Symmetry: D2
Subunit: 262 residues, 4 copies
């Protein structure tokens, strides 16, 4: 019949930080493709709510309460996922926080909280998952990075951007170490994506954000989930150590004047 | 997994061999009808016959991508055969070698003309039909050579592949109000019929310098193009995806050898 | 005494397209450092005016009328420069035009005019200069590229951006071929630089351009000349095939909102 | 050629050896007074004595870059010795090796702490003095490893070097109203005292994989930092300059071999 990509139905995934925002969208996109998904988070109430919301998906979404900055929780997460699903094929190293603080105000704890969730939590879940991902014979790691850091700057986010670029520096070497294991590791770099959190500002400001983007809208969490889904396919086995910016063209204009001359 | 592309309409320039034929076959397997272009009627005919069993219908238009009139003719004939046009794979590419001293104006124009001007002209000629589709997709076949790497003898080739990307970073902005996205696949070293004539020692040396330990397949490029063409990639534009098994990552063979 | 870089006094340079704008600034910066400079251009009146304006510089600025898109003129330029100066050490492949046209309006001639000056004219002057630059034992090629093409998009400039990215694709290979000749080749990527031409718009619009740039001003042609001067130094002999963006931070903000949150 | 930097005031973190000592010597030769930092008083003392004949005065402050209090102390002592502070070279860097499986939390924090947090803390502590100078300059010593390349065993090192750049792309915007620029040099393979203990075969193998055919010198990095520090580089900020002899350009040793 018609064939696009090979179905991922019945494979096993972890989405760290999966109870809300982009991570929830990644989880729902994989579950709609028939992949069983464990989402992680620190807040059991939020995890339970998201598991309930997603109860009708084809693949089964369940939760593990875990702190990505603790390697022992990362190992517990992988073990619990393998127990529930039977193995582990896909890790979406997604968990991310984005508090703001100008350079002169950032404390050591501010810097370590952001680097610890965003960067160390990516490393630790990949480390815990290596043996199972190797055993799968088609392991996939997708990292949720950002345009902020690798490409752009944004006042108040110099530690955030540092952490998102750190993920990429890490994976450019990790892809080489993981190639003999037949695991690929790539990152999605979201631009400005509409989430529950951004709903807490007015249409005025959201319209200003959209008008600065060539696509003329903020992205959806499904836009990120679908990019991660492509990297997870068998058909992406020759893509590794790489990045895909998903931003409706946000990084392209040199300024709003270039947008306006349209 | 993704919304079916069955029944949509695609052009793949330079589709009779190599990466283009892989792109064509990948879309045709997805049920997309595909017009491939090329200058060699025999190669086109051969590939049309080879792919006669695909779900989507693969047919050929003989056309020189360096000629805007052939580009307009290719689009018109595709709209006539299929009913419209959803996807343009601006793929045609040549890669003759010449050291900088040896490159003549004609050498430079032949490579810039096929690889860069032929991408611009097919996009230009397809603009109206792609706009009417409401979900238009352009996928450009670039290269790691030019945008990322250097390779002696390919300074004009690398220039033309980087030129494609400079073009589409602006084109993406001009095309966004028409709901057309434009993105590029940057292949590394892909096993094609031509590379299969090199001998196993040569292919083994090439593969051993790549972290994945093999050359890619033309389907690797076809499937990246297929992703960009999905409705689910509507928020991706002006962007690149390198499909190279890790080729660009090591600083040197010493890094590969540390594995 | 105090030593910064090794003096370039008495070396020999070509600046293509040097009668106005960035190229004039490159020429004046090299001439102030004691380098003799041949500027090229198609308009003898403009060349003569610039030679007159620069008559007091330490190094001597003179002109050759030549079309960068003609390899025979590129060879004549190199020969005339060697005749006037005694050799050739530095080539600034600068000539650039930037007409605007939307994608649906660009003709083959529009595309070839821009690719021919901006890209082919860079290749042809480097080709003509190779034997003399090799003989110098410290050859330098500096390419004037742009943020537009390599990094940004700007409606109406898709052929312009293509041509500026083509220069970089070319030089990433050229640097390898030229390394055994001890010639380096690098590019400056200017952002928005104030020139005679931009003076033909109002302070209103120029202020809007500056306000979109972290440095809070448009750049000067000396900013580009000084970057090219660094690449030309003996102290830059280990820099090759590379780029330096000179733009006051223009490419960094994700949008004007990031600038405004400052 | 450029405006003399004579009499200005610089800090070079990790200045007692390797690239940092080259940066220090290059600025001191330009007549800039330089405070180098390090944890090893003997190495600092040795380098201060070696450079006693420079035009600018090189002196040492013993300090751990991972400690913000030491960063504030380094700035205060530099302002006291020199009268102010014009230039910070955030250079300190370590590069222990460990495969991904073997890296402990402590391994990762040691490298992130020196290479990334130590860059942030010295910039933070210098903000006020750099602002008062009216022409403040920060130059970060990053690496091709992380931002560009991958090297087995250096995934935490590469992360920390890319982290520096993500930081300075925002820092550049925050610092611009203060007239401070911030830029990074990305060294390739540089001949240091440590690399000189490897044997000629090893150094020859490394050099043969680089288009320039040699390892760079610590002065190559020092002179790129010196350019960023000039008044003539005031319109350069948030940017990178790779100093690597072409190392990142070839896709593989085969490309180098075609020369
Ligand atoms: Cl990065
Ligand atoms: Cl490019
Ligand atoms: Cl480029
Ligand atoms: Cl980076």
């Amino acid at each position: 019949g018609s064939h696009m990509f090979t179905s991922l139905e019945g494979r096993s995934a972890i989405v760290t930080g999966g109870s809300k925002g982009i991570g929830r969208g990644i989880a729902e996109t994989f579950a709609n493709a028939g992949v069983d998904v464990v989402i992680t988070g620190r807040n059991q109430d939020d995890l339970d709510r998201t598991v309930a919301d997603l109860s009708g998906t084809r693949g089964k979404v369940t939760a593990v309460r875990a702190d990505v900055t603790d390697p022992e929780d990362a190992r517990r997460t992988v073990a619990e996922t393998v127990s529930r699903h039977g193995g582990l094929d896909i890790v979406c190293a997604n968990a991310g926080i984005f508090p703001s603080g100008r350079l002169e105000d950032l404390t050591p704890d501010d810097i370590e909280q952001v680097l610890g969730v965003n960067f160390k939590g990516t490393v630790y879940i990949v480390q815990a998952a290596l043996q199972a991902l190797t055993a799968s014979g088609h392991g996939r790691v997708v990292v949720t990075s950002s345009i902020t850091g690798p490409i752009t700057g944004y006042p108040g986010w110099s530690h955030y951007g540092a952490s998102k670029a750190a993920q990429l520096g890490f994976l450019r070497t990790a892809a080489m170490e993981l190639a003999p294991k037949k695991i690929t590791i790539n990152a999605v770099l979201p631009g400005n994506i509409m989430t529950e959190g951004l709903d807490e500002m007015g249409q005025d400001y959201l319209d200003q954000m959209a008008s600065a983007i060539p696509a003329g809208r903020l992205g959806s969490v499904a836009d990120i989930g679908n990019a991660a889904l492509f990297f997870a396919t068998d058909e992406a086995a020759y893509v590794t150590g790489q990045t895909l910016v998903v931003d409706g063209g946000q990084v392209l204009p040199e300024s709003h004047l270039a947008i306006a001359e349209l």
